[PDB]
Amino acid sequence: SKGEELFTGVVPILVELDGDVNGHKFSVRGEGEGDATNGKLTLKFICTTGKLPVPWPTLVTTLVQCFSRYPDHMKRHDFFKSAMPEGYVQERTISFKDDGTYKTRAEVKFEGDTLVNRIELKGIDFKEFGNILGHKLEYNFNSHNVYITADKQKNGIKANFKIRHNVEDGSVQLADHYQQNTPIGDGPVLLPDNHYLSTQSVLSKDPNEKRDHMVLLEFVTAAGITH
Ligand code: NA
């Protein structure tokens, strides 16, 4: 297909986020590459405004599902690649249980040969001494299933899923994700049957990096439709 042909090789990635959480203004820039054939991406993110005012794990889902490995028998259900190169808008509400809410708006699209994710994030009602603004979250990220359903009215998809962040006192911080994706092109796009993405992530640090940063390794495969 047109869209899927853009992802047969290794694709450079750029991520830019401007965020405002309880009045904290911050920016993040990420760079790396994605290999959708193997469902794998490698990225390094840097807070370009100084210290990140929220924990890095809380931004992982906001910081390119077009790099998911869709098995051959499922390629008919890969909305994300089918919207390319024109791209799609990805919007989310992320409700941290007993805490504040992120609202995000992003565009994911090709800018030349680079796949770019540009994000605006607004967070309100966060607890200044809670798990997020208090930086009480472990520096890791557990495996999740993202459940995707078509949204024929918007010619796009919706997704719902619950992220679980390990709190350093042993408890767990829930973050309910509500997600809507709309194509930017006028071209036709694949609308999928119900299915899910299975995601696994590894967070690390670059020892020679003095800025506040996150190295991210991610592995995503699609599933939920019988061969
Ligand atoms: Na372009």
Do the beta carbons of residue 101 and residue 94 sit within 8 Å?
yes
Beta-bridge partner residues of 32: 13, 43
Residue 62 corresponds to which tokens in the numbers above?
A: 């906001």
CA dist 104 and 120 (Å) reads 6
Q: How far is the CA of 218 from the centre of ligand 1 (A)?
A: 25
Distance 57 CA to ligand 1 centre (A): 30
Q: 38 CA distance to ligand 1 centroid (A)?
A: 23
Least Cα distance to 82 among 109, 112, 43 occurs for 109
Ligand 1 center to 12 CA (angstroms): 13
For the chain, the farthest-separated pair of C-alpha atoms sits apart, in whole angstroms, at 50
Residue 202 Cα to ligand 1 midpoint, Å, equals 30
Report domain extents, the chain.
1-227
Determine the distance separating the centroid of ligand 1 and the alpha carbon of 43, expressed in angstroms. Answer: 21
Q: Where are the alpha helices (DSSP H) in 32-121?
A: 79-82
1-227 in CATH: which number?
Answer: 2.40.155.10
What are the two backbone dihedrals, phi and then psi, of residue 187, each rounded to the nearest 5 degrees?
-55, 165
CA of 83 to the centre of ligand 1 (A): 13
Q: How close is the Cα of 144 to the center of ligand 1, in Å? A: 31
Resolution (Å units) = 2.0
> Apex CA 90: angle with CA 157 and CA 152, to 5°?
20
Q: Which two tokens stand for residue 203?
A: 């967070």
Give residues whose Cβ lies within 5 Å of ion ligand 1.
Answer: 110
C-alpha 158 – ligand 1 centre gap (Å):
25
Size of the chain in residues = 227
Q: Are 50 and 33 in contact (CB under 8 A)?
A: no
139 C-alpha vs ligand 1 centroid, how far in Å? 35
Rounded Cα–Cα distance for residues 48 and 18 (Å) = 10
CA dist., res. 216 & res. 35, Å (int): 14
Cis amide leading into 55 (omega within 30) = no
User: How many angstroms separate the CA atoms of 57 and 40, rounded?
Assistant: 18
Angstrom distance (rounded) from CA 147 to CA 68 = 13
Structural tokens at position 94: 């992320």
